[PDB]
Amino acid sequence: MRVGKKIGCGNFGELRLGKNLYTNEYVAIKLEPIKSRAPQLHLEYRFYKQLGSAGEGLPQVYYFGPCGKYNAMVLELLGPSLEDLFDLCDRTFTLKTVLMIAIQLLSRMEYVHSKNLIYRDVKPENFLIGRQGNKKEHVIHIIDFGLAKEYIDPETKKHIPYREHKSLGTARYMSINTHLGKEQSRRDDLEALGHMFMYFLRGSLPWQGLKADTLKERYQKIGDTKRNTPIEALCENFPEEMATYLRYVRRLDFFEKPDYEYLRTLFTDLFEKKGYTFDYAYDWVGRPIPTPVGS
Ligand SMILES: CC(C)n1cnc2/c(=N/c3cccc(Cl)c3)nc(NCCO)[nH]c21
Ligand SMILES: CC(C)n1cnc2/c(=N/c3cccc(Cl)c3)nc(NCCO)[nH]c21
Ligand SMILES: CC(C)n1cnc2/c(=N/c3cccc(Cl)c3)nc(NCCO)[nH]c21
């Protein structure tokens, strides 16, 4: 409605509706308290700037600066997330929808990697369609670069070294090697995507809803269960290509450049085999799509 409206409640701050005075267009204002003892917003801004707004499926970024008691980052206003659309579609997606998502997100993640960044926060909440009117509703955008990292050193142009005993993104989708505390690299982004694709097809993953003693133990139980769930069991009654995908990405080496084209062709060949047309008729098309604003 009017600018200044709260349009999102984030983990580190909030999201408000703004206007671009140059165009009269609505924009998104991401806010983080200046008092934050774990500031993330400026890091994110710097990453967005390294990516640029050239490659498709990245929000345009306009501004970073202090705004009252907040730091403010202003960027392109988008539509709902894949998780919201998953909820709208009663928490399963068709194969056709999942393949259209997968093919696009493989290009998106490749682009991110091409800019020397690893993403490290794959989850459905972080992939948003464009707004309805704005003719980019078919485009799946990647957002939230707060957990990202430069994996090629700017100075030496060398890949970051291998390391262990690391922190611990989001437990539901993270790679097995992330659970083991290994430094994440390009492979881990692709494995998390694969877990997300299987989440969409199945409706859930078998390491969801586990009970723990503490956060530490839940991460442990989830990681243990991922290892104990064979890909064959995980992908039972879905096309073999899903299992082929998971095997490939699980078997990538730390420094290895993924063959993104191989993975996209795996899904495109299945897409053609099934007789599907890439018409952007996702499952949610024809349903009432949430919109952040009208005008
Ligand atoms: C690039 C980031 C800062 N960005 C841009 N647009 C959005 C966004 N748009 C909304 C917000 C509320 C409802 C809807 Cl349908 C879209 N939501 C979110 N997050 C969900 C908060 O409601 N992030 C957005
Ligand atoms: C009335 C308030 C809620 N409002 C409305 N629109 C904006 C706003 N819009 C911007 C700021 C920078 C670039 C662009 Cl394109 C829009 N920014 C801000 N704050 C960031 C710049 O001070 N506030 C805005
Ligand atoms: C691209 C830049 C010049 N730009 C475009 N629109 C804005 C902007 N929009 C506002 C701010 C306050 C109220 C309203 Cl309605 C819009 N604010 C700001 N504030 C930050 C200083 O420019 N910048 C804006």
Swiss-Prot record:
**Catalysed reaction equations from the record:** L-seryl-[protein] + ATP = O-phospho-L-seryl-[protein] + ADP + H(+); L-threonyl-[protein] + ATP = O-phospho-L-threonyl-[protein] + ADP + H(+)
Record GO biological process: endocytosis; positive regulation of canonical Wnt signaling pathway; signal transduction; Wnt signaling pathway
For this protein, the activity regulation entry reads: Repressed by 2-(2-hydroxyethylamino)-6-(3-chloroanilino)-9-isopropylpurine (DB08325).
Q: Which residues form the active site?
A: D121 (proton acceptor)
E.C. code: 2.7.11.1
Keywords, A to Z, come to: ATP-binding, Cytoplasm, Kinase, Nucleotide-binding, Phosphoprotein, Serine/threonine-protein kinase, Transferase, Wnt signaling pathway
UniProt keyword Kinase, yes or no: yes
- Single GO MF annotation: ATP binding
Where in the cell does this protein reside? Cytoplasm
Q: Which top EC class is named for this enzyme in its record?
A: transferase
Signal peptide (from-to): none
Superkingdom field: Eukaryota
Belongs to which family?
A: Belongs to the protein kinase superfamily. CK1 Ser/Thr protein kinase family. Casein kinase I subfamily.
Its quaternary organisation is: Monomer.
Q: Which named protein is this?
A: Casein kinase I isoform gamma-1
Protein source organism: Homo sapiens (Human)
Gene name of the record: CSNK1G1
Q: Which residues of the full protein are shown?
A: 45 to 339 of 422
